[PDB]
Amino acid sequence: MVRRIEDHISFLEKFINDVNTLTAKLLKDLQTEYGISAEQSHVLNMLSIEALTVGQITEKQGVNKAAVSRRVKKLLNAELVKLEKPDSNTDQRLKIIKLSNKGKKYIKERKAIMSHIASDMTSDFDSKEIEKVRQVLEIIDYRIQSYTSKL
Amino acid sequence: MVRRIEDHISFLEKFINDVNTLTAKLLKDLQTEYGISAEQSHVLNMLSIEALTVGQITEKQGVNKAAVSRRVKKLLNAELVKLEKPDSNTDQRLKIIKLSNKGKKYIKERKAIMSHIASDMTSDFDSKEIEKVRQVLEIIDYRIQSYTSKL
DNA sequence: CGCAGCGCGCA
């Protein structure tokens, strides 16, 4: 079973980006309606989970110092993302940012489009068998977290 | 039951990002040891599944037609990744970008890497309770591959 | 403190 998991990891690595490629194509309309960019829906999304700093966002994907700040430099500018303390400076390491009601009603319009196409894709399933999936994926998740802590 | 389906996608959303971050904060190993920008790494993941062209490579994301072109040439004018016809001006239609020896030699390294971790991570499971999960997963992925046809 | 607004059809 040493060649087995290399597959289950290869599949996920497949099923994963087939969820990625989809999202983007399936969403492009509301990213031209809201005028952003993929590499921004993926940035918005992360705070649609809960508030983050710019220093907190960088570690997650690419360790781009401020090449990712030119990507939040637009985000705020388009009203979407809003600030920490309306007190004025030129400080960027201080502030923490969250989504404004505009980057929030984007999200309502986002998790409505997927909370359609997937509600379909799965409308025929056993729940006492889709939980038995959720669960297993909760663990491998949890684990993945109590390891996204350590080394 | 009309909503329960919701948390699942967000969860599945969440879940990748985690998986997405672990691979990154974990492959930042061989990434620099091959002198490659992180997201480039991503580009290679598909080319690993089959033969492919720049147009195709942009299909799994957004309008990065001359935006993911640097990305590929940064894997051409920089190591790994072959080209199709060792000489080509700029016409990317006669260009069919494949993989060089190390094009696997990297995927071959990275894979067994992100694997021992997934070998560890899951090891108290009877192959049976993972398998099930793999199936419902294989399905939801099929349904995606198809519904990724019309547009 | 490494780039952004462009190859919608081209035999």
Residue numbers in the entry:
A (entry chain B), B (entry chain A): 1 to 151
Excerpt from the publication:
The transcription regulator teicoplanin-associated locus regulator (TcaR) is a member of the multiple antibiotic resistance regulator (MarR) family involved in teicoplanin and methicillin resistance in staphylococci. TcaR regulates icaADBC, spa, sasF (the first reported regulator for cell wall-anchored proteins) and sarS transcription. However, we showed that TcaR interacted strongly and cooperatively with single-stranded DNA (ssDNA), which suggests a novel TcaR function in regulating DNA replication and in resisting ssDNA phage invasion.
